[PDB]
From a paper:
We describe here the high‐resolution crystal structures of GM from [name], reconstituted with AdoMeCbl and AdoEtCbl and the pseudo‐substrate (S,S)‐tartrate. As previously observed, GM forms a hetero‐tetramer consisting of two copies of the larger ϵ‐subunit (an (αβ)8 TIM‐barrel) and the smaller [name]‐binding σ‐subunit, showing a typical Rossman fold.
We have set out to test this AdoCbl‐activation hypothesis with two “stretched” AdoCbl‐homologues, designed and synthesised as potential structural mimics of “activated” AdoCbl, provisionally named “homocoenzyme [name]” (AdoMeCbl) and “bis‐homocoenzyme [name]” (AdoEtCbl). In both new structures, the electron density for the “stretched” AdoCbl‐homologues indicated an intact bond between the cobalt ion and the terminal carbons C6′ or C7′ of the 5′‐methyl‐ or 5′‐ethyl‐adenosyl ligands of AdoMeCbl and AdoEtCbl, respectively. The adenosyl moiety of the bound Cbls and its protein environment are positioned at a nearly indistinguishable location in substrate‐bound GM reconstituted with AdoCbl (GM‐AdoCbl), AdoMeCbl (GM‐AdoMeCbl), or AdoEtCbl (GM‐AdoEtCbl), clearly defining a firm H‐bonding “adenosine‐binding cavity” (ABC) that intimately interacts with the substrate‐binding site. In contrast, in GM‐AdoEtCbl, the organometallic AdoEt unit displays a ribose E1 (C1′‐exo) conformation. In the case of AdoEtCbl, an intact Co−C bond is also observed, but the E1 (C1′‐exo) ribose conformation and a strained conformation of the linker between the adenine and the ethyl‐Cbl moieties are indicated.
Author numbering:
A (entry chain B), C (entry chain D): 1 to 483
B (entry chain A), D (entry chain C): 1 to 137
The structure:
């Protein structure tokens, strides 16, 4: 297939489906006619798109954990605990990393070893191996909407299975589920394969079945400047809407400066709506998800609560529709159900302690918002230029030329030239610009802000500051100060 | 420190890369020649690199938890490739979940790993251990 | 002695000291000449007043816990743990309640019972029974400044012992350590005995020994409107300055709405400085302390962390010089050293995650600040008028006539007519005004804000909402919504 | 007719008052005549109120933790004052610190308290126990 930002025809989409469903024997359990009927029978309280609408209307932030284990019954018991004891508003199913690399043979071995060991040797739920039948058992055992959360360059079959399995949201995108999650996958291929995932949701919407799609804002979770992260999210939203997706949650990973994070989430939401309307997508329901600190966590569990709950306070004051819950086991390993529930309870407590409260507008916030919108528009303008008006082609050439560049991304198709670092108040700025197409005025503001940190710390801004910032939160503070 | 060559990678289907970058930075600064095969590396990539570069040690990083699977059998393959006695280190977040550390260390040592590192191990600990083990303190 | 807001003469004060020092045999260990030399040998790192100055200078918020047990060595080990493992910036010593009621006989029995049981049967440290000798042993065993934290209407002897013991801050005030802490003590008598505690600090300052004084802002910890709380703190600050106090930390208890709380702390600091300078006290160094939620806590420890850390975020963004640490045992009992260190670590993590960040000015914040200052000035204006220019007499008469009125105060000299309740955003407002001398405009703003809650909840504003608000946080949310 | 009278206070050198006000409210709303002696109340104040009002029960609240000292001997003094068999309730935060609750409950029952309540007990629990114990359910 050639890559073009255009809705696949029904015929072209059907041809792809028939190939994709053959990639594992559980694909034979996907019956689009039957799945539509099953999806339409799901109560609204368990439909992710409809509950997001509810959250927007009521102006509340919903808490969603991450969670997944190899075996079906243990996974169900896990999700039931996070629902019942944790108080989750949405439920995940986090997919294991073998599935994300399409290694269902290794999934199966991991399943058997997990059975033998009495504990999960997989780092998530192998949804392709458990098939439509298993994913439905998960949905039928819980009372909350379910969303696949993962990190999969080629998610086509996983998407067929989890949607037919009644999970009414799929997370990911052709950029955000490639560059942080792969090394050898071309941007062109991941975009094409994520066109399939968006097109499947488009098909379902055309039958009246509402399914949420959530681009993965945080990317590498390591000092991603808001404007580069927002440019990715806006791009993936536009690419999804073209394939017929109607319900989109754009996401952002916390950087830690409250004003910057609130500016970012508002710019993300405002410019996502603006760009969707500019390009003729007039019936897309946009929500936001704020991810609690996605960098290295401190190992001390009390300090972990300090990160979890400050992060939640930022999410609540930003007016995030959703917040993703970190746990006090973040530094160590996949959380126990008790550690996860602990994080959920602390998060929802914080949310209820902040009911209805929003950061009011200020000069400082409006200034940071204009910075981010200007920086994001530089990147997106150049992408449309490079693609000669086609955003999907422009994304490929943007990565080829370093116009879009994700810090620390393992993908060999990521230039790895742009370098981020915090300023003196902890705002993530651009240290090295690479080929990121900023005006001199925008570059000067980044340098001005960084120079204040050089003055305060008595040292030149440098990659050592970047390393310090990478370790700072794990060592107990936001900013990587000397010593 | 006298120069020695190590192979460094992230094993299996694991895509975490920031630690790989720091470890390469740190072990390079300490005077090592780091042959960095990067993320998503099967066992064969470590061994092929160790052979081509005549490495003194293989540092297997494993963050995503499934290293307990991926790491089994590396020593045997190193023996069969003629790398008998090569140093094998494994660190990161190498099992799924918080576990009792003495049990984890024995599990990976029994797989044939010379040193086994807990979550949050500073690279300086690995560098000091490697200098000791290569007797170049 | 008659009550006047006039600095005691050296002769008057000395006459009182010789009476006070006879109230327990440990008064014989107090040698003012010797104590001055001892205080002057404490390094600056261990002087509370001087460390507050450094905190203000560096723009940082310092975390201070509460802590106290019957026995000396156990208390020392406790404080060392909070210092070393907790990372405290300041150390308390919380006095037991028998001391606060001057029942040193019962202190002595509790010491003996605590020795027999191997655990503290006292809820704090009996500083008077342990004497200067004991209090100096605490100071010599720690590396941080020491403050007595208590709740004592007649603190004269305690103050003598703990200051001569090297503790360079004393918390309290003639109002804030009477009405929430006493039943039968007249306002005139507690004001007079606190004039003593203030005058002792004034003597020490005249010798060049710097000692901090901290009025107890939160009062009853139970929905205290910011303007009533601030009027108390400004009053106690002015009454202390008149006796020669030079270093004062005015305090405020979190109400839970971030904008209201930040408005409250800034109004408190601004009007304290304004009033001090208006009344000719031109060399007083003012700092602030923000108390994390002083109402009922949730029993669940993760939820408790949610309160602890949201509260810390408010304190940091407010620019508080100091924040007092709650622990996850708040709902249950006096925390273990581990639960206290847990609270300190979560708090300090939050502070370090917010380094240098402050709430920027907003129209919303500007409005709430104007409301609070106007409300506070009505109360203080009426007090001065009632006292014919004398604030101490004005305070006695304000309590006699309900001009100053502290929600749920046990003091029979507290009118108990003013009734507080939260508005639809969680801001504490006046539900019933009693005799609080507000203008009709001020009253009408309070009613308008409360009507939004009636409209939103579908029920009339009422004392039932007050009950609901009293229980809400323990039940997992700020606002006592129905059902 | 017979409307039941209780004595309600906070024992010892304890000044906590909000719970006392809530308990007064709720037990009044439940139909009890509440003789509220308030905070900072020595044992004798409970006994004197109980005699003057012919109270059917004394509800001792102790929040500040030193109730394990202050509560000892109430039952005996109630016997010696002629109030044999009166209901003695104690609730709040009655020992210093988080403790194993069954141990605490037995300790206060061993002092002669009929019912002992853990932190955070709703008034409605005490109201229901008191109606049952007084056979007015
Ligand atoms: C940022 C992050 C992400 C980013 C990574 C971006 C990228 N490509 O690099 C994103 C969000 C994409 C990501 C994805 C996922 N992640 Co992640 N990630 C992290 C996080 C938050 C920090 C890692 C980091 O960069 N640290 C900073 C660097 C400098 O430190 P480091 O990586 O830990 O490595 C240092 C030390 O460990 C040590 N070290 C490491 N290896 C070795 C080896 C030797 C020999 C020695 C001596 C020392 C040593 O030195 C290194 C340098 O300082 C951690 C949790 C945490 N630590 O708080 C989770 C974590 C590693 N992730 C985890 C998981 C499970 C996932 C996924 C695998 C999810 C899944 N179920 O598939 C996916 C990846 C998909 C895949 N194919 O593998 C888990 C692992 C669980 C377990 N082991 O039980 C963790 C621990 C989180 C958790 N508690 O659940 N993640
Ligand atoms: C607000 C508060 C304060 C205010 C009180 C204002 C006032 N005068 O009322 C202030 C700040 C002044 C205060 C002071 C102190 N406090 Co205080 N306070 C609290 C707090 C935060 C909430 C209490 C409250 O009002 N709750 C709401 C009301 C409605 O409920 P309640 O009082 O808990 O009681 C309910 C239930 O227990 C039950 N109940 C209570 N008694 C009874 C009896 C019966 C028979 C029944 C059936 C039910 C029942 O029904 C009540 C109503 O619903 C608690 C901790 C918490 N709960 O989160 C600490 C707490 C009670 N305080 C405590 C302490 C130690 C102190 C001091 C004694 C400090 C000291 N070392 O001297 C001082 C008081 C000095 C003195 N002389 O006693 C400790 C007790 C420690 C322990 N027992 O191990 C607590 C538990 C905090 C802690 N975890 O350390 N406090
Ligand atoms: C670093 C990856 C981002 C986040 O992804 C969470 N995550 C991944 N896999 C699982 C799982 N199987 N169960 C519970 N949480 C999981 C980690 O905790 C981390 O916060
Ligand atoms: C309710 C009193 C306010 C705060 O005062 C703390 N407090 C009182 N006494 C001690 C003590 N002896 N040790 C540790 N904290 C103490 C309580 O926990 C509460 O948060």
């Amino acid at each position: 297939m050639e890559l073009k930002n255009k809705k696949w025809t029904d015929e072209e989409f059907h041809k792809q489906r028939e190939e994709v469903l053959q990639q594992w024997p559980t694909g034979k359990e996907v019956d689009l006619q039957e799945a539509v009927d099953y999806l339409k029978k799901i109560p609204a309280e368990k439909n992710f798109a409809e509950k997001l609408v509810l959250a927007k209307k009521k102006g509340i932030t919903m808490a969603q954990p991450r969670a997944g284990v190899a075996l079906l019954d243990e996974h169900i018991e896990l999700l039931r605990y996070l629902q019942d004891e944790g108080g989750a508003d949405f439920l995940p199913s986090t997919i294991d990393a073998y599935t994300r690399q399409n290694r269902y043979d290794e999934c199966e071995n991991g399943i058997k070893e997990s059975e033998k060991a009495g504990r999960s040797l997989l780092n998530g739920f192998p949804g392709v191996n458990h098939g439509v039948k298993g994913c439905r058992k998960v949905l039928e055992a819980v009372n909350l909407p379910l969303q696949a959360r993962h990190g999969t360059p080629d998610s086509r079959l996983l998407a067929e299975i989890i949607h037919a399995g009644g999970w009414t949201s799929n997370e990911g995108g052709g950029i955000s589920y490639n560059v942080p999650y792969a090394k050898n996958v071309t941007i062109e291929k991941s975009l094409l394969d994520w066109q399939y995932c968006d097109r499947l949701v488009g098909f379902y919407e055309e039958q009246g079945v509402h399914i949420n799609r959530e681009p993965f804002g945080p990317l590498t979770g390591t000092l991603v400047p808001p404007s580069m992260s927002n440019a990715v999210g806006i791009t993936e939203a536009l690419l999804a809407a073209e394939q017929g997706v109607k319900n989109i949650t754009v996401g952002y990973g916390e950087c830690g400066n409250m004003i910057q994070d609130i500016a970012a989430l508002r710019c993300l939401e405002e410019q996502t709506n603006e760009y969707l309307k500019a390009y003729g997508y007039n019936d897309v329901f946009v929500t936001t998800v704020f991810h609690q600190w996605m960098g290295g966590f401190p190992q001390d569990e009390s300090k972990a609560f300090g990160v979890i709950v400050t992060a939640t306070t930022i999410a609540a004051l930003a007016g995030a529709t959703k917040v993703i819950v970190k746990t006090p086991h973040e530094a160590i390993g996949i959380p126990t159900k008790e550690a996860n529930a602990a994080g959920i309870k602390a998060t929802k407590m914080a949310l209820n302690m902040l009911e209805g409260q929003r950061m009011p507008m200020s000069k400082e916030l409006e200034t940071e918002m204009a910075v981010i919108k200007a920086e994001t528009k530089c990147i997106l303008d150049k992408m449309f230029e490079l693609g000669k008006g086609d955003l999907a082609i422009g994304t490929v050439k943007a990565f080829e030329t370093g116009v879009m560049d994700i810090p620390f991304g393992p993908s060999k198709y990521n230039a790895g030239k742009m370098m981020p670092v915090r300023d003196n108040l902890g705002c993530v700025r651009y240290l090295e610009f690479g080929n990121v197409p900023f005006t001199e005025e925008i570059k000067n503001y980044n340098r001005e802000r960084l120079q204040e940190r050089a003055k305060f710390e008595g040292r030149d801004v440098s990659f050592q500051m970047v390393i310090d910032d990478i370790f700072a939160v794990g060592k107990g503070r936001l900013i990587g100060r000397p010593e | 420190m006298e120069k020695k060559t190590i192979v460094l990678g992230v094993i299996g289907s694991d895509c975490h890369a920031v630690g790989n970058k720091i470890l390469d930075h740190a072990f390079t600064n300490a005077g090592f020649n780091v042959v960095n095969i990067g993320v998503l590396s099967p066992q064969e990539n470590f061994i092929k690199a160790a052979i081509e570069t005549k490495a003194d040690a293989i540092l297997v990083s494993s963050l995503y938890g499934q290293g307990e699977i991926d790491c089994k059998g590396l020593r045997q393959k190193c023996d069969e490739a003629g790398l008998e006695g090569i140093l094998l280190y494994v660190g990161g977040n190498i099992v799924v979940g918080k576990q009792h550390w003495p049990d984890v260390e024995k599990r990976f040592k029994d797989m044939g790993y010379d040193r086994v590192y807990a979550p949050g191990t500073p690279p300086e600990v690995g560098i000091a251990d490697l200098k000791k083990d290569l007797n170049i303190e």
